UniProtKB/Swiss-Prot annotation, chains C, F:
It is a multi-pass membrane protein. The keyword Transport applies. It is found in: Membrane; Synapse, Synaptosome. Its main location: membrane. The chain crosses the membrane at residues 5-25, 75-95, 105-125, 144-164. GO terms for molecular function: ionotropic glutamate receptor binding; voltage-gated calcium channel activity. This is Voltage-dependent calcium channel gamma-2 subunit. GO terms for biological process: eye blink reflex; membrane depolarization; membrane hyperpolarization; nervous system process; neuromuscular junction development; neurotransmitter receptor localization to postsynaptic specialization membrane; positive regulation of protein localization to basolateral plasma membrane; postsynaptic neurotransmitter receptor diffusion trapping. The L-type calcium channel is composed of five subunits: alpha-1, alpha-2/delta, beta and gamma. Interacts with the PDZ domains of DLG4/PSD-95 and DLG1/SAP97. May interact with GOPC. Acts as an auxiliary subunit for AMPA-selective glutamate receptors (AMPARs). Found in a complex with GRIA1, GRIA2, GRIA3, GRIA4, CNIH2, CNIH3, CACNG3, CACNG4, CACNG5, CACNG7 and CACNG8. Interacts with GRIA1 and GRIA2. Interacts with MPP2. It is linked to Defects in Cacng2 cause the stargazer (stg) phenotype. Stg mice have spike-wave seizures characteristic of absence epilepsy, with accompanying defects in the cerebellum and inner ear. One of its GO terms (cellular component) is cell surface. The chain holds residues 6 to 208 of 323 of the full protein. It comes from the Eukaryota.
Swiss-Prot record, chain E:
Belongs to the glutamate-gated ion channel (TC 1.A.10.1) family. GRIA2 subfamily. Homotetramer or heterotetramer of pore-forming glutamate receptor subunits. Tetramers may be formed by the dimerization of dimers. May interact with MPP4. Forms a ternary complex with GRIP1 and CSPG4. Interacts with ATAD1 in an ATP-dependent manner. ATAD1-catalyzed ATP hydrolysis disrupts binding to ATAD1 and to GRIP1 and leads to AMPAR complex disassembly. Interacts with GRIP2. Interacts with GRIP1. Interacts with NSF via its C-terminus. Interacts with CACNG2, PICK1 and GRIP2. Interacts with GRIA1 and SYNDIG1. Part of a complex containing GRIA2, NSF and NAPA and/or NAPB. Residues 7-22, 23-25 dip into the membrane without crossing it. This is Glutamate receptor 2. Detected in forebrain. Detected in dendrites of neuronal cells. Expressed in the pyramidal cell layers of CA1 and CA3 and in the granule cell layer of the dentate gyrus. The lineage of its organism: Eukaryota, Metazoa, Chordata, Craniata, Vertebrata. The chain holds residues 586 to 626 of 883 of the full protein. The M4 transmembrane segment mediates tetramerization and is required for cell surface expression. It comes from Rattus norvegicus. The postsynaptic actions of L-glutamate are mediated by a variety of receptors that are named according to their selective agonists. This receptor binds AMPA (quisqualate) > L-glutamate > kainate. Induction: Down-regulated in the pyramidal cell layer of CA1 in the hippocampus by global ischemia. Residues 26-31 are cytoplasmic. It is found in: Cell membrane; Postsynaptic cell membrane; Postsynaptic density membrane. It comes from the Eukaryota.
């Protein structure tokens, strides 16, 4: 231990965090764009399925 | 008596636009694009052929308005009635909630972490957070004192200085204070109080 | 009134002209890198070292559950699909000399513009989530992509308003 | 050229006051310049309440309170706290 | 007949969804035994 | 109805007077310092000692990124703009005592008062933000700095009400 070359028991960096980042939240954008896709898919029907 | 010298920490200089800091730049970049996309898609769905101008009050202006108001959590004046716009409304709302809560939590966390700080004081805590380097004049009586004493805190400090590398020892008091100033913190120096409170 | 048909062509032209350069240039990202340990620039396809004698020493990039997203990034289809859909929108707005007074192709052009616009947002999200894998910064082609997106979402609304002014306006 | 909205002064104050809190008021600007304002003010509020909540959550954890006098010299630049010595002893003669 | 409120199944679904995410929806129950469901949720 | 043309003028001149008095006096702040430590008071321009043998001695203040904001604090451009706009508003309402029935003087006057208020806000905010980088307290000229705004906006509202009451009453 007393000629060791690493923090053998305590190494707490306790950092100012790296802020929240897009890697943590991207799932919400992933669902959002799919919701817009479904919206257009139904919009191509709602007003015009009775066309003849 | 023997006492310790450190770099004076100055005072902080908060940036005027600090309020964006708890949320990384790419988030703010993507928010505007998603806002535009949702507003334009809600317009395009809102004005297919009614077959009459009263059929839908959601012209493009009102679409932009409703999108903004939905994001700001302050309400609106006209909700969408077509299922098409209903769904996207709901989704967008969900997104808004997620973002708001996340931001708030992050800010709170950052504040707490910035106020647990407990700066190094009393000169005994130095025993633990040995990532701040410390040393003495070489060949001096302070060195002989640390070698000769037999108390666990000083035993540990001695064992550290005896085993740490690169060398913490210096030739002259001028060299010592120069090393402190040039390290801009993170290095602390040992000398007699009647010398310390003169350098101050 | 009436004259805005020109602006549809001007917008679609600008968007198509921008996006080819945006997809076709090696200047999406600046970073530290290697070209076998120096400041470096990278496109979607290849990476080049600079800031020294090795200027223009380059190699093709290697991209290699997370595997499926890595494969989506590697196939890189969404940027190119944006160009494909704007090309189809161009083929749509070319319908000046057929099915006049119907304008349904003109309306479909708005759909193609919107679906193109979505593609760049997806692309950027995928790209950033891949680069998250530096003190980096973004080159001009990123701003070219963003500007082409903005012009894409600009022109579709005006095209659908023209469809209204040329078809709905006839209903009385 | 526009004499149709209900934005009397007192009504405008009522809108603003409601818009500081989150209770969605009935009236809307209905015009362009009105919405320019209504946009920004919303953002103002959104940021303020957030920050306040964060700081509240924060202070209630660390709870560190010291330094009434400490400096051992600032005991003379006030007259709220009394101080004195043993009488008749050398501690007085020192003074 | 009693007609004090107009809620349909789809409309009620929309009201409830909006009410969950606190986005100030338009219609209210407007009668007895509806205020309770409005308050609880 | 009627008398509104009078009360606008006295309030405008009162706001003008109290604002120029605020700009001109040594009692924005109380603190400690040295004029060459002792209780000390400062205006915007100059700082002067009290409570001792040096009482009434004064010194200049060292004005010199934050450098640009410090230059803004030094020039004090925003309260100067507020003063000059408030003066021009008073001149407008005084000028509206002749060449009457055009009614657009009052429309400009309200805008003058409101813009003087907006110019006061930024001034006060910058003045505080520059110090908060001590048992301080704000002096009565700070409260004059508040009252200038409090009356100025009310005078502007009264001005616009007077405008809508004088004008177009011929047809409504």
């Amino acid at each position: 231990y007393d000629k060791g070359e690493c923090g053998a028991k305590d190494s707490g960096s306790k950092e100012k965090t790296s802020a929240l980042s897009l890697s943590n939240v991207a799932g919400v954008f992933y669902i959002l764009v799919g919701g817009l896709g479904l919206a257009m898919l139904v919009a191509l029907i709602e007003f015009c399925y009775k066309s003849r | 008596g023997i006492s310790i010298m450190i770099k004076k920490p100055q005072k902080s200089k908060p940036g005027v636009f600090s309020f964006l800091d708890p949320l990384a730049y790419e988030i703010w970049m993507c928010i505007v694009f998603a806002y535009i996309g949702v507003s334009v898609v809600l317009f395009l769905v809102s004005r297919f052929s009614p077959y009459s101008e009263s059929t839908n009050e959601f012209g493009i202006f009102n679409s932009l308005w409703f999108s903004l108001g939905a994001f700001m959590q302050q309400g609106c004046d006209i909700s969408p009635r077509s299922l098409s716009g209903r769904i996207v409304g709901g989704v967008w709302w969900f997104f808004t909630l997620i973002i708001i809560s996340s931001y708030t939590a992050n800010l709170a966390a950052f504040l707490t972490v910035e106020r647990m700080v407990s700066p190094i004081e009393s000169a005994e805590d130095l025993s633990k957070q040995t990532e701040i380097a410390y040393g003495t004049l070489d060949s001096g009586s302070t060195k002989e004192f640390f070698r000769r004493s037999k108390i666990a805190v000083f035993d540990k400090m001695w064992t550290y200085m005896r085993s740490a590398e690169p060398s913490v020892f210096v030739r002259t008091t001028a060299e010592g204070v120069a090393r402190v100033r040039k390290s801009k913190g993170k290095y602390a120096y040992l000398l007699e109080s009647t010398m310390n409170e003169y350098i101050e | 009134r009436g004259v805005q048909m020109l602006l549809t062509t001007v917008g679609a032209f600008a968007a198509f002209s921008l996006m080819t350069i945006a997809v076709g240039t090696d200047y999406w990202l600046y970073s530290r890198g290697v070209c076998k340990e120096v400041m470096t620039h990278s496109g979607l396809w290849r990476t080049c070292c600079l800031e020294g004698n090795f200027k223009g020493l380059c190699k093709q990039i290697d991209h290699f559950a997370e595997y499926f997203l890595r494969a989506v990034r590697a196939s890189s289809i969404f940027p190119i699909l944006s160009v494909i859909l704007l090309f189809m929108g161009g083929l749509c707005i070319a319908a000046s000399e057929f099915y006049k007074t119907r304008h349904n192709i003109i309306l479909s052009a708005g759909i193609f513009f919107v679906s193109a616009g979505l593609s760049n947002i997806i692309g950027i999200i995928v790209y950033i989530s891949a680069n998250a894998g530096n003190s980096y910064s973004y080159g001009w082609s990123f701003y070219f992509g963003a500007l082409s997106f903005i012009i894409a979402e600009m022109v579709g609304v005006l095209a659908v308003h023209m469809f209204i002014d040329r078809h709905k306006q006839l209903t009385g």
